[PDB]
Design a protein around this ligand. Structure first.
Ligand SMILES: CCCCCCCCCCCCCC(=O)OC[C@H](COP(=O)([O-])OCC[N+](C)(C)C)OC(=O)CCCCCCCCCCCCC
Ligand SMILES: *C/C=C(C)/C=C/C=C(C)/C=C/C1=C(C)CCCC1(C)C
Length: 227
């Protein structure tokens, strides 16, 4: 009966599910208050992803948008996942380096703009204006990456070296993974239409699992989260 990207939505669901269960069991077993905060934020991340992957697998979160002369499938539920999960990831990073309150507000604001303007782009009917929204979104993304690379690293230098070195691995993972998203959007079913929907779903699933479960495994096994 159903669409060919179903298999990657199914594999996504299973990996986000097992990662959530694993983080939950390890988290409930620790007593340190600082570690526990990291566990709570980091378990919630793949939990939200699991629910959105499951919804899309069962045929929700999907709409048709007319552009370029034809009717194009667009998965909007992805944006509902990212709207909450991307700022939770940034909060992990900010807590790890003791970032200022004003910095966090600015980053979460920027992140909201990135996801909101990405979604507006995805839903826009005049082909060339899709890319105006994409460009605004990518600018907001680049501001985030600049602040993580220059501002957060400088804050990390005032921490003990094992905290600084955990931050640097997470930072490097984040910059590499996050910088690929605007490229997948540009060339896939939301932008140019070159890479088909099934392969695009495969790419976003690998990126998402790496950015959430991978990131999580690295953070939650470090000594850096302990009080
Ligand atoms: C990360 C941020 C960096 C990117 C920022 C700028 C990059 C340089 C892009 C400029 C190229 C476009 C200029 C052009 O060349 O001509 C103008 C083009 C004609 O468009 P129009 O005749 O429909 O009316 C438009 C008139 N109006 C807007 C009032 C309705 O202005 C447009 O629309 C607007 C489309 C341009 C903005 C989005 C850039 C395209 C990005 C990549 C596209 C990739 C293709 C695979
Ligand atoms: C768990 C999900 C993660 C870590 C997702 C990150 C998603 C982005 C960095 C998305 C960025 C986008 C742009 C830069 C422009 C166009 C569309 C967006 C949402 C895909």
């Amino acid at each position: 009966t159903g669409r060919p990207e179903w298999i990657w939505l199914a594999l996504g669901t299973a990996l986000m599910g097992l990662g959530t269960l694993y983080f939950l069991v390890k988290g409930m077993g620790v007593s340190d208050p600082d570690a526990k905060k990291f566990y709570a934020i980091t378990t919630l991340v793949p939990a939200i992803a699991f629910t959105m992957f499951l919804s899309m697998l069962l045929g929700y979160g999907l709409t048709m948008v007319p552009f370029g002369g034809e009717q194009n499938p667009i998965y909007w539920a992805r944006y509902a996942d990212w709207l909450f999960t991307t700022p939770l990831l940034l909060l992990d990073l900010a807590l790890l380096v003791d970032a200022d309150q004003g910095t966090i507000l600015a980053l979460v604001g920027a992140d909201g703009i990135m996801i909101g303007t990405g979604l507006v782009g995805a839903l826009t009917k005049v082909y060339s204006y899709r890319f105006v929204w994409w460009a605004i979104s990518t600018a907001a993304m680049l501001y985030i990456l600049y602040v993580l690379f220059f501002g957060f690293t400088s804050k990390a230098e005032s921490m003990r070296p094992e905290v600084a070195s955990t931050f640097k691995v997470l930072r490097n993972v984040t910059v590499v993974l996050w910088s690929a998203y605007p490229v997948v959007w540009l060339i896939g079913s939301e932008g140019a239409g070159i890479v088909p929907l099934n392969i695009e779903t495969l790419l976003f699933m690998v990126l998402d699992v790496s950015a959430k479960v991978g990131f999580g495994l690295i953070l939650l096994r470090s000594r850096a989260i302990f009080g």
